Structure formats: structure tokens, C-alpha cells
Design a protein around this nucleic acid. Structure first.
Ligand SMILES: [Zn+2]
Ligand SMILES: [Zn+2]
Ligand SMILES: [Zn+2]
Ligand SMILES: [Zn+2]
Ligand SMILES: [Zn+2]
Ligand SMILES: [Zn+2]
Ligand SMILES: [Zn+2]
Ligand SMILES: [Zn+2]
Ligand SMILES: [Zn+2]
Ligand SMILES: [Zn+2]
Ligand SMILES: [Zn+2]
Ligand SMILES: [Zn+2]
Lengths: 131, 131, 131, 131
DNA sequence: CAAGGCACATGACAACGGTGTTCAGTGCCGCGTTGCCCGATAC
DNA sequence: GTATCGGGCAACGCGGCACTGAACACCGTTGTCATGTGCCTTG
């Protein structure tokens, strides 16, 4: 995820960290990892870099029920929904043509000016269910 | 809106406000409406009664971008999703058989033990765009 | 370390950590220890409690060369001075009456109506020098 | 006022401004003085040249309560402790042998390999007390 | 019907855990500059 | 042989834009203390 602005070690390090993690992680959880790495990127810098890469669309952003937003790096450039397990903290990338068609059809039925479908699935995997 | 908690004048006043407005409203906004009525239900009372109704199932919960939870009363007890306009705060109930099937299919392919899917569409109204 | 206002678990949690620690530590450093302890006090909560305890005099505060203030609970509330080992991150309490008298005499020569005398020492122990 | 860095017009201007002031001055404030003179020396250049002079020991430094760095040029080459009035912002150099001996003695019994003793006094002068 | 018996209730505070804004302070990549450094010069 | 002269010069200056460290501010939610309101047997 190349940052749009002039490259610096801190922004490059957060970009590398997003590639290193394949799970949705909040800024506080990522900043703690970078502090343990010894990179020295500040919590405020981690917030600014995560927001810039997410605005570019390089990293996907999701919100939990608690209201804490989480950011993950996605291999697929194309838009897709996600099935996420809270216990794993990891998400699966899946895209639905039918759900997208249903959202457009619902917008057509109500004559809504624009469509911004937000389909997200939250389920726990069998491995986490086992204890 | 039947409330599981012991019956009191305060619970009835907030329940009346929920029935009065179909559109999603924040707990603070509902408290302000009760203050205007003269019911003067306490903010700590409005927050507790809204949350209690939600666990019972009388009210449905949604997340505004600002991150403030909003509560509305729904006539139908069947599973449904909401097509809501952020600009006008107007919510219309929408149901799709295909979205249920797609969510079930993603859960089945990944073999997650328990899965619950939350879906909503954000669009402006044709009347709203009209000037 | 007591806080003047009504006590809560979070105020007690930061106070317990300051009593447990025998060295000066920053708000961010103390917060990471508490997060691992599972107390779950927020960084803003760590800052508000630390500042209140320091005002009471329960915890003595020293300013580091970097400029990030570090807080520690001293053995006695009596006035004293500290010699800090940078490698240890811990200090030894030593007070000189003569230095206070010297500061008072020179302050009187200055003509100051009232004066505040502060002394700090930065060094390293013989054991810390060995590597 | 010698500068370790290669001599140039900008370095001549910052050194002259430091010579003119006999009180602790913020690096940004010295830059403000230089633009007022019309020297138009760069702020980044003012910061690096002040740091080089401080490393040389030509101009002394003090850490303020806010934590910003202030630089004062001193007539006396020999070591001393600055008594800076909080109200005036001006410092009079006073040296005490006893405080140095006390710091050395406590460090020696503690067994510290090396120690640096720093003493600062802050008070309002009788003239400043007058209003 | 009213006093008791008891509970659940309320509300006003007193708190808080996120994410966002000021800073002095410092990366950076272009510029410039200065005493040195040499090659002449025609005498 | 000296000496002043033009010009190049490469290892260094400079400045402006740009971006970063902690400490601090906001805002929807509560956790903790007290008391008035509601009902049920017992009289
Ligand atoms: Zn994705
Ligand atoms: Zn989609
Ligand atoms: Zn799982
Ligand atoms: Zn509904
Ligand atoms: Zn559904
Ligand atoms: Zn609309
Ligand atoms: Zn102490
Ligand atoms: Zn003292
Ligand atoms: Zn040591
Ligand atoms: Zn000095
Ligand atoms: Zn004064
Ligand atoms: Zn001394």
C-alpha cells in the first residue's frame, strides 16, 4: 500500500505492518505491535497513515458493534463483502452479484437517488467454537 | 412497545415516543422530544429503557456514521433489513429472499457454527434531490 | 495513593500500579503495563488519575531529557531529592539540607520575595555499566 | 561568538542576535528577532545552529516547565547554576561548591560510575512582586 | 384502606474509553556559496 | 620569478515544504450513590 504523500520511514513501516497482518486490527492494536517492533511510530501517526491508505482504498475498513473501527489489507482490488469471526479476528473476502443486484433493485423500487449497499456478515468459525 | 422491566410512567413515555416516530432516532434525541412533551424522562432513564426494549426485540438498533446508536420501533417481528436516507433520516423496511440465501451460502461454505448477517442500504430520496 | 474525588475501579487500578512500581514511568509506559494486566484503563484515564495523584503529592514527578514527564510513588511524603540511573530506570532518594540553605542565601542575595529550589542528578550504577 | 559550522552570513546574524540577548530565548523567538532585524535567517537553520552552539557549550540551555528549549549566552566560561526569575525570564549565574560536593558524595556512596548535577531556582523578584 | 411489609424502580451526579487537534521540533529534497584550486596572463 | 587575473569547482552551505513526538480536547455512553414510587400480605 504506497502512501500518496512523500515516502518516510514511519509511513512505510505502517504500510508494511498492514501487509504483515491478514486480520482486521484497530489503530490501538496496530500501534502496540509497532511499539513492540521498535519502529517508534506514534499512535497519532498510526491513525493518520491508516486513514490515508483506507481513503485510497488500499486497506478495507469495518466497524464492530462496540464502535471501534478495524483496518485490514485485502489481496483483491475489486469491492467484496466480508464474513468475519470475532474470536479469530480474521475475515474472509467474498463478493455477491445477487446481493448487489437486490440492493440496486431495492433502490429502483423506492426511486432512491444513489445506492450505497453495506452488506457485512458476522459469524464465529467452528475452530473458535471448539474449546 | 411492551417492556420486560416493571411497569412505570417513565417507561410508557419513552415507549410512546418510539411509537410516535417510525424513523431511527438517537437516545439523546428521543430524550429531548420527551423533554419538549413535558414527560421529562431522565437521560439515564431513556438510555436504560431503549436498551431494555432492544434486548426484548421491540426496537431495532442502527449505527450512524458519527458512531451514535439510533433506535426505532418496527411493526413486523419477521427478519428484515432497512433502506434508510441519511439526509432526511427516513427509514423504509425492505426484505430480500436472495440476501438471506447468499448469507446462508457464505456461512455454509466456510462451515461457521453460528452466523448472523446485518444488511442496510443508504440512499437519497428523489423528492430530496428535487428542488 | 488516594484520589480526592469519589473512588472508582479505574482510579484504584492506576494507583495500585504506581504503588507496585518502584521507578519513574511515563503515562504511556504505565498504560501498556496496565493493558497487559487486563485492568483495561484507557490512556486518557491513566493521564487524569496520574495528574490528580501528583497534585496531592502521592506520586513524585521527574522531567526526562526527551521531555516526557515520568511519575513514581516515593517511600516518604517528606521533602527530598533523587539521583536517577538512566540504565535502571529507577532512582535512589537522597536529600541535602546544605543545598537548601545555599539556595535560600543566594535567593535572598537575588532579592526574590519567595523562591523554589529544584535539583536533579542523571548517572548510571556500577552494575549497569557492566554488560 | 564562534560557530563550529562553516562561517556564512546566516550564522553571523544568529550569533549576533544571541550576543544581543543576555536572557534565555526560545529558538522560535530568536528566529522572530532575526526576521525583525531583516536578516531573514531560516527557522530550520536557526534550530540547527542553536543546537551546534549548545553542543560546543558556547551558548547554555534550560528546560522550561512547558518543555520547550530556551538558549542563553553566558559571559562566564566556568561552570555555574542559573537563577532565572519566573516573572522576568532573565537569569543571573551563581555557583555553589557545596551543592556539587553533595551530589558527588551521594553518587560516590551509591556507587554510580558517573553523575551530572543540575540546579535551577525559579522565583519572582521584589520589583516583579511590585505592581 | 391503610398501616405496615418489601421490592423492584428512578436521576443526578460521578465517572470513562475511544478518536481527534495543538504544538515545538525535525525529516526531506532541491537550491545556493566560498574559500580553495588551478590555469593561464604579459610582464 | 613574482604577481594579479578569469574561471571552474566539489565538498559543503542554505530554505521551504513537508511531516512527526507527547499532551491534551472533544463527545456518547455509563458505573455509584441516594431516594420517591409501586405493590403484596396482615391488621
Ligand atoms: Zn476485503
Ligand atoms: Zn458488494
Ligand atoms: Zn474463528
Ligand atoms: Zn425494522
Ligand atoms: Zn437478512
Ligand atoms: Zn432523502
Ligand atoms: Zn521524592
Ligand atoms: Zn529540595
Ligand atoms: Zn543502574
Ligand atoms: Zn550559563
Ligand atoms: Zn523578576
Ligand atoms: Zn555545579
Amino acid at each position: 500500500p504506497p502512501v500518496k504523500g512523500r515516502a518516510t520511514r514511519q509511513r512505510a513501516a505502517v504500510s508494511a505492518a498492514l501487509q504483515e497482518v491478514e486480520e482486521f486490527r484497530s489503530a490501538q492494536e496496530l500501534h502496540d505491535m509497532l511499539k513492540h517492533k521498535g519502529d517508534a511510530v506514534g499512535l497519532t501517526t498510526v491513525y493518520r497513515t491508516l486513514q490515508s491508505l483506507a481513503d485510497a482504498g488500499e486497506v478495507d475498513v469495518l466497524r464492530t458493534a462496540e464502535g471501534e473501527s478495524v483496518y485490514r489489507r485485502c489481496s483483491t482490488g475489486d469491492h467484496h463483502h466480508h464474513l468475519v469471526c470475532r474470536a479469530c479476528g480474521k475475515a474472509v473476502e467474498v463478493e455477491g452479484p445477487a446481493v448487489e443486484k437486490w440492493a440496486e433493485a431495492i433502490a429502483a423500487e423506492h426511486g432512491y437517488v444513489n445506492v450505497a449497499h453495506t452488506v457485512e456478515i458476522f459469524g464465529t468459525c467452528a475452530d473458535c467454537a471448539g474449546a
